[PDB]
């Protein structure tokens with residue numbers, strides 16, 4: 001790595017780990033389409049296992065980007081349409097509040113107030129049906145955005161139905177494999193457990209708990225190497241051989257709604273570059289990120305814009321992640337940590353680094 005990248009990365013990350021008391025962390029900077037790695041501390045404190053380029057971290061909601069791209073791919077294959085009613089793929093969803101709710105609304109959190117979390121009691125398949133049948137929207141479709149696992153997780157579940165494949169089989173066959181993300185998992189296999197870092201919450205070692213729609217909304221675990229490949233693939237979809245995947249990536253990066261200075265794609269969120277740092281830094285704080293906000297439709301949607309700061313934060317009880325990239329600049333960053341620390345601190349560090357590199 002050029003001394004310049006090494007310099008900004010270490011001068012930015014070192015203080016971060018110290019002030020946030022982060023046990024372990026891995027960072028990847030993609031500069032001119034080439035990846036450079038950095039690792040710090042521990043993946044498992046007790047057994048003194050250091051973080052390495054093979055350490056698996058829980059991505060949390062960064063998993064939503066994979067779900068968005070998998071849905072985009074399904075659209076490109078002509079298996080589903082974002083214009084399709086939710087009921088077309090789940091006829092059992094007969095309650096009338098579901099009438100004007102399309103796959104687009106589910107994918108972009110604009111269905112009308114679906115909750116950030118699926119209740120813990122909802123476990124079985126019929127459990128899930130009852131939950132959505134009983135849900136009472138607080139707003140009409142397409143008027144308010146409320147970041148929700150129950151919205152995009154359902155989008156992910158329905159989107160793979162015409163394929164005949166299970167969500168994880170679809171994700172493996174159509175996204176991970178074609179992209180060579182060979183150490184990216186929804187269920188980590190026994191043989192790879194040795195690379196699975198522990199997350200830390202108040203000194204306690206923890207891992208994400210299973211839950212309804214978890215694979216779709218926050219269940220991916222991955223390495224800093226696989227994540228840098230994910231960033232490269234999203235920075236340059238044109239150089240992806242599988243046609244429907246290249247398209248799916250562009251569809252996930254298209255602008256569907258605008259809220260403040262942000263635009264909602266499928267999983268990914270974007271802003272026009274150059275961007276005002278405080279706009280992305282303050283916007284990443286949950287007081288704003290998780291708040292209900294009115295949206296303006298982009299009719300029709302704007303196709304992926306090269307000059308964008310495309311990003312997504314992610315967290316589990318024990319991990320904190322962040323991905324951001326500027327296509328026009330062939331520049332990107334991945335930050336994986338085994339401690340959930342505040343989003344603003346993550347975006348500011350990413351900003352400090354990327355602004356320095358170009």
Ligand SMILES: *[B]([O])([O])C1=[C]C([N]S(=O)(=O)C2=[C]C(S(=O)(=O)C3=[C][C]=[C][C]=[C]3)=[C]S2)=[C][C]=[C]1
Nearest residue numbers: 060061062149208209218313314315316317340
């Ligand atoms: B996503 O990372 O934005 C996301 C994921 C989940 N589900 S989960 O099991 O990963 C959990 C994440 C947390 S948390 O990050 O402490 C939290 C975030 C926001 C609101 C409450 C808790 C707990 S379980 C849920 C929400 C967002």
